[PDB]
């Protein structure tokens, strides 16, 4: 049986993608994966990477499925970053990954932001510099600060992130996009197929960056299939 492992997106929980699961209704196992977060608010994070969470979670996750049978790997936004990084460390220990389905997250090395040399701090002010704002409204001290962090720091994770041309992955990827999202667009999240030696597709769908929501039987079902088909036997 296949054991189909979900990332989240940025601020994204394990409840928020309960209803995306209970969609499956199927011969395939589903385990949410849930990011050490829990308060772990931290800005200018020297320890927080994409590889070294992707790290973490690895460690956490090799124990839920034996060196056997089926895995395939899902990840929305950021989740899609971290579900590719933690599907090649599965890969590099010979897991037998069926696929990797991407989900309004652009190809490593095709995001625009490289702001990884912008510190935190300083990253406030940038996002002050461009619009018409008073410096005290956003850089003042009033929460605005706290509630910052939690995307601030997703932001250079993100931005920093980059993956060698020749590290790819030996499962044919699935890339799903909503039309209307500028976060990640058709054109960024189609470089994916340079992240595979085999197969490749992409899904347009209708809506934006939280179409996931507008379109869940027709997405699961193409998951649900895909999963099945390589898997069966």
């Given at each position: 049986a296949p054991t189909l492992y979900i990332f989240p997106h940025a601020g994204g929980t394990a409840k928020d993608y309960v209803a995306f699961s209970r969609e499956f209704s199927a011969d395939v196992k589903r385990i949410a994966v849930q990011y050490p977060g829990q308060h772990d608010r931290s800005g200018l994070p020297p320890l927080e990477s994409i590889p070294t969470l992707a790290d973490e979670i690895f460690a956490m996750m090799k124990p839920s499925a034996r060196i056997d049978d089926p895995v395939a790997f899902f990840g929305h936004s950021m989740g899609g970053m971290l579900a590719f990084e933690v599907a090649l460390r599965y890969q590099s220990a010979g897991h037998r990954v069926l696929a990797f389905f991407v989900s309004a997250c652009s190809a490593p090395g095709h995001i625009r932001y490289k702001q990884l040399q912008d510190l935190s701090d300083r990253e406030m002010l940038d996002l002050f510099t461009r619009?018409?704002?008073?410096?005290?409204?956003?850089?003042?001290?009033?929460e605005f600060f706290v509630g910052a962090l939690p995307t601030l720091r997703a932001v250079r994770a993100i931005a920093g992130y980059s993956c060698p041309p020749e590290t790819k992955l030996s499962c044919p990827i699935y890339a799903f996009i909503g039309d209307k999202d500028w976060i990640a667009t058709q054109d960024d999240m189609d470089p994916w197929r340079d992240r595979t030696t085999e197969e490749f597709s992409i899904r347009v769908f209708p809506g934006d960056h939280f179409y996931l929501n507008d379109n869940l039987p027709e997405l699961v079902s193409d998951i649900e299939d895909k999963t099945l088909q390589w898997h069966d036997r």
């Open positions: 619009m018409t704002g008073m410096n005290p409204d956003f850089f003042t001290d009033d």
